[PDB]
Amino acid sequence: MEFIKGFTFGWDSQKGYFKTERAKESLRLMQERTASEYVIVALAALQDTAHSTEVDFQGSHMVDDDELIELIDYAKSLGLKVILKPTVNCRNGTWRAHINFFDMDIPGEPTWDEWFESYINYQKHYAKIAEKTNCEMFVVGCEMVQAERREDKWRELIAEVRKDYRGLVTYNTDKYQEDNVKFWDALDVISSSGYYPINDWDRQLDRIEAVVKQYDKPFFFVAAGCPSRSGSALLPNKWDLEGAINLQEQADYYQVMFEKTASRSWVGGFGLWDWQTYLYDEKDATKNDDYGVFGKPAERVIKAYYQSR
C-alpha cells in the first residue's frame, strides 16, 4: 500500500452541511493547502452515556445518506481517495474510550450484547454506503479502549462488516494500545491514534514496530495531530487541555512527528486531525487554538512533508 497522505474532514458536520458549497470549498482548500491525497470522513453517532446501549445515527447531528454520498463522490472528483470512519460520542461528553458494561450479564443491567447489537446496526449501515461509493477503506471503531477486551464481539462485528463491504477494513485503536488489540488478524490494515508526546517517539515507535512486523498488513496513524496550544505537544490527544495559544508549538509537534516517522518504512501514513467542514476565516488563524492547521505554520510543515513522500 502507498503512503497515505490523509486528512480528517467533516468532524464538525451536521445534517445539511455536506450539501453546501461551503463544505465543498473547504475540502478543495484542504487538498490545495496540505497536498493530501486521502480524506478521512469522520462521523459520530451519539449515545446518551458511556453505559447506554442505543447508538443513535438517525438524528440531525448526522449528515444524511444522500449528502454523504454526494460529498464522497465530490472528493473522488478531486482525485482524493476516501476512508470512511463512523464512530460514536456520548451526549454527556464522556470520551468513547470509557464505553463499558459489566463483564457478566446482570438482570436489568445494560449489557455488551445489547450495545454491540446497536453498534453493529450502525456500522453495517455505513459499511453499505462505503461499498456503493467504493470507499478505499472503512474504520469499524475508534479508540474503544475498554470495549477492546470483548474480542469475540469485535470479530463478530468485522464479519458483519465483511458481508456489506469488499474493501479494506481497519480498526482505530488508541495510543499505547497497538500491542493490546487481539484481533488484528481479522483486519486488513492496522491503525492507531498516534497522539504520542513530542519527546517519546523513539520508545513508542519501537513498541509499535514490534507489533506491525508480526503481520503482513500496512500500518498507519489514522488519527494524529496537535492543537495550537501551549502544553499540547506533550499531550496532543487532550482536546480540552487548558493552555494558552501557541501556533509555534503545534508546528514543532508536526516537524518532530514527521522527522521521527519518515525513517520508519512501516509507518504507512496519517489521517491528520482535523480539517473542519465550516472553516474559520484565515485572518483568524493566528487566534485559533484548535486542532486545525488552516492558515497556520503547521500547514506549511504538512504540505512540505506530504509533497516529499
Ligand X SMILES: OC[C@H]1O[C@@H](O[C@H]2[C@H](O)[C@H](O)[C@H](O)O[C@@H]2CO)[C@@H](O)[C@@H](O)[C@@H]1O
What is the contact surface with ligand X in residues (CB under 6 A)? 11, 57-58, 62, 64-66, 89, 143, 193, 223, 237, 239, 273
CA-angle at 174, arms to 131 and 219, nearest 5°: 60
The number of angstroms, rounded, from the C-alpha of 306 to the middle of its chain's C-alpha atoms is: 18
Closest CA to 300 of 247, 243, 238: 247
Shortest distance in whole angstroms from residue 59 CB to ligand X: 8
Contact criterion met (CB below 8 Å) for 232 and 198: no
Contacts of 132 (CB under 8 A, 6+ apart): 69
Q: Which of 139/168 has CB closer to ligand X?
A: 139
143 vs 249, beta carbon nearer ligand X: 143
- CA nearest 204: which of 229, 224, 218? 224
Closest approach, Cβ 202 to ligand X, in A, equals 23
Smallest distance from ligand X to CB 224, Å: 9
Nearer to ligand X, 111 or 204 (CB): 204
Q: Shortest gap between Cβ of 25 and ligand X (angstroms)?
A: 21
Q: Which is nearer to ligand X, 67 or 111 (CB)?
A: 67
Please tell me the distance from the alpha carbon of residue 206 to that of residue 223, in angstroms, as a whole number: 19
Read off φ and ψ for residue 119, nearest 5 degrees. Answer: -65, -40
* Integer Cα distance of 222 and 175 in angstroms: 11
Are the C-beta atoms of 250 and 298 separated by less than 8 Å?
yes
Nearer to ligand X, 94 or 248 (CB): 94
Task: Please identify, using beta-carbon distances, which residue of 57 and 305 lies nearer to ligand X.
Answer: 57
Q: Which is nearer to ligand X, 93 or 107 (CB)?
A: 93
- The C-alpha atoms of residue 219 and residue 195 are separated, in whole angstroms, by 15
H or E segment at 304? helix 297-308
Quote the least distance from Cβ 289 to ligand X, whole Å: 11
d(CA 89, CA 99): 9
* DSSP-based three-state secondary structure for 48: coil
Least distance from C-beta 65 to ligand X, angstroms? Answer: 4
Q: How far is the CB of 70 from ligand X (least distance, A)?
A: 10
The residue among 144, 194, 186 whose CA lies nearest residue 168 is 186
Cα 84 to Cα 87: distance, rounded to the nearest angstrom? 10
The C-alpha atoms of residue 172 and residue 87 are separated, in whole angstroms, by: 10
Min dist CB 66 to ligand X, Å, is: 4
Considering beta carbons, is residue 89 or 111 the nearer one to ligand X?
89
